[PDB]
Symmetry: C3
């Protein structure tokens, strides 16, 4: 069984107690109110649900006797009981990898991690609740980018000159990872600290992506600013340019932004979010009402050095529909309709 059987137990010396067990406990009671234009469908999707995103993980580091880079590894399970889905999570569904890190050249990781692009798209630009629009939202064909991805080599640089830092990565695609395609992708991201600000830029290219009966080339570019100030204010703003190119000559473009404001004061943190996709342009013809936007408010309370309570409201107004290149409806995050969500939740880290 496996590349080297269980011969690891028979020949190597067990490095006893060289692990940390960790977990994030996270529950969110969330009520959803849909306006899909169908009353029956509105009642199924909408309602109260308990979105339990708790998870257990294991991680550790080892200094190999005869290797300069330090070995690192991680196995993090998925959400134990998310909303809209069944119970029980596997080990290895979130960030799971081995890797090396030397003070001389930064960090390398092989396995299942976030692409340099998505890492910025996810945080800060997706919080709180902007993900339906800015994360996996959109109308562009092909693969706008990957999120958390397996079969990935990712290199994380150290803080160069105490201001600059780099992340770059390449990997196989979703279909390639199952032996049923040859899609691949690559991407890189940059960060520069200019005082209390931080500037960000990132790129990602996806290739040989089969969808809607075509092969796709996807290119996505991103710029953003982030600020933290001592009076308590933090902000973030981001602009995102999405370009898709199909094998039948069809070109596609769509852009999007995300911005968030927050005031931390003592034991409280107030926060407003807004993100939006602009109209999608296919073959140089703007498609009417292909945009999405979402507004969001949240009050958080630092109940413990290790935990927080929070309430949150948000309203998603999605596009009115899109047609695919195969002459059938193309799924978007708004296929299920506009909806509002009100929720309270807890998060705790041990």
């Amino acid at each position: 069984d496996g590349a080297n059987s269980d011969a690891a137990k028979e020949y190597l010396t067990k490095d006893s107690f060289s692990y940390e067990v960790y977990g994030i406990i996270a529950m969110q009671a969330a009520y959803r109110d849909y306006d899909s234009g169908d009353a029956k469908q509105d009642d199924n999707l909408g309602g109260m649900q308990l979105n339990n995103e708790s998870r257990i993980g294991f991680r550790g580091k080892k200094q190999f006797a005869n290797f300069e880079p330090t070995f690192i590894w991680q196995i993090e399970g998925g959400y134990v009981d998310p909303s809209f889905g069944g119970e029980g999570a596997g080990l290895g569904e979130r960030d799971t990898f081995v890797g090396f890190e030397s003070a001389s050249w930064g960090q390398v990781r092989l396995g299942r991690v976030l692409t340099p692009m998505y890492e910025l798209v996810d945080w800060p630009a997706s919080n709180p609740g902007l993900g339906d629009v800015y994360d996996w939202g959109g109308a562009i064909g092909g693969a706008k980018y990957q999120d958390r991805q397996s079969n990935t080599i990712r290199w994380d640089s150290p803080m160069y000159a105490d201001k600059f830092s780099i992340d770059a990565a390449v990997g196989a695609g979703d279909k390639a990872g199952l032996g049923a395609g040859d899609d691949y992708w690559g991407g890189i991201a940059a960060h520069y600290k200019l005082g209390p600000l931080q500037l960000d830029a990132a790129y990602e290219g996806n290739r040989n992506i089969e969808a809607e009966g075509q092969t796709w080339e996807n290119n996505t570019y991103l710029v953003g600013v982030q600020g933290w100030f001592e009076n308590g204010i933090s902000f973030f703003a981001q602009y995102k340019y999405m370009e898709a190119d199909a094998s039948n000559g069809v070109n596609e473009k769509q852009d999007a932004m995300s911005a968030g404001l927050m005031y931390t004061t003592g034991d409280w943190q107030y926060k407003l979010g807004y993100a939006a996709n602009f109209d999608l342009e296919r073959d140089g013809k703007t498609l009417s009402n292909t945009s999405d936007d979402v507004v969001s408010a949240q009050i958080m309370y630092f109940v413990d050095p290790s935990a927080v309570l929070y309430a949150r409201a948000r309203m998603n107004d999605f596009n009115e529909g899109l047609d695919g290149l195969d002459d059938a409806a193309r799924w978007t995050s708004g296929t299920n309709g506009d909806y509002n969500e009100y929720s309270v939740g807890v998060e705790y880290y041990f």
Copy 2:
């Protein structure tokens, strides 16, 4: 990813070493002898199997700095290799929840737990091996009650006056948990200790259940006694009334009982149990041969304060079949036929 991604790891202080790892090791070597009236089907279902119900779990408590109630959480994986099923269980398949508790008002839990009704159906009734008949057995339409269920808020009262105790909960149904329905349920249970006896009462109502082309209403009532005596005798008895009501006017009723006698002597414990479903009445007319009954015997031996060995035999006589309100056979615990079972097993708690 998620309501707050990995922002808990980057910003919150890791409460290091504040978790418990626990497990129940449980193996059951079980031979089954089926009498379904088909020699082939008898041979597939019947035979020797290893029912491995072992499980690993994680749990903990934390006193939040600025909150009086103590935080609680649990994540329990399911059976690692049960009979009739493939190997491997996810993390979070069993009781998995967050909650708070103060000794003045008991505990509240959010997540996936046992409903107050089913908990009594589970223990003391249903043991040993009475479950096929009393637990998920029956012929009534809709949902007589839920088992272990997600999207549940449940409050467990403290022991008032050291004699009275209460459990209550409400939650989402199976289809709602996937955004495909609007079913819900609620229930309550009461306990009173009168010396060596204990009285039990419980209710559960199920609403908006889609099945066999109808919407269903379910109502279930339960009463029971339990006795522990120093001489060594222990017993339990229970009566259960189930009322279902369909959207096309059809009414349905069925009742059941469960009783068990037990003799503990030193390191040994003998136990004989009986459970039965009585004929189902649809539209106030008894349906012939819709009953089920089971007899069961078991010898247990306390090999360690932390483990037990046990032998057990049981014979199940199931109902012979009934059609649902859609004119198709309604699945029951006897769809696979009658069967007797002989088994040995171990249980261990770390």
Copy 3:
């Protein structure tokens, strides 16, 4: 739920801290180049992939107060993110069992383990990368033997006279474990160490195996030698004879060999491996082009007492096709075509 509900938590004394957490970290970057005579399939199946075979497990032992044999238990999860498959593994997918052990007669284990034959087929044969041909390779009908299998009772003898050793087991088949068949199997294996050499023999018989419209009986025999010398040289050689017999009278026979050479020198270990399946004989007529071959080379580096690095190249030349007794293509490990593979990897034991 289950054979005894959650009554183990309610009555038994938690044997706190009698659990060990263990894991094997294993990542392999593997490039594949397929030449199946189909270009689209060559590129889907072929390419670079990251085969993460890491795994977490738990094991422990307990001395029961009122039992002389020591109780042992194990729950080992599966590969967290293997190549050609999705992410996330269950708890209990690798070796998972309960058992007892006394120094007088060895150990007995109930659950999920390797059959005495496969353990030898697995290690030392099949390494490095000979498994496609020697492990699950072959063209014989029915089931030559089981891999890691559930519903198994297995006995491992002590080291008799410091030279002799025996392993034997019996269990249920793949279909029987799901209530859909009555297949079973049994097998035994013996080892004798003569100085720097070691002699190996094993047998396994499988019965009531349903496939290709017939029921099958399988008989598989194996002999092998292993050598370790102070010079640094080690080798292994194995011959395998497989006999299958169908319910329509059709007989089939096929044999195979596996061989490996290794030179350990300081912190490096070189290794050449070869394994092959010979032409398949059905009804005493050798079938043309049913043989399989694989050559493999490997460089290993003991990077730490607890880990190794390795590079590996290997060439797989498979059979040209075979028809089953149902007059349809019979799946073999070469159905997807020939492929060569170049790979690097790390393995770590904590």
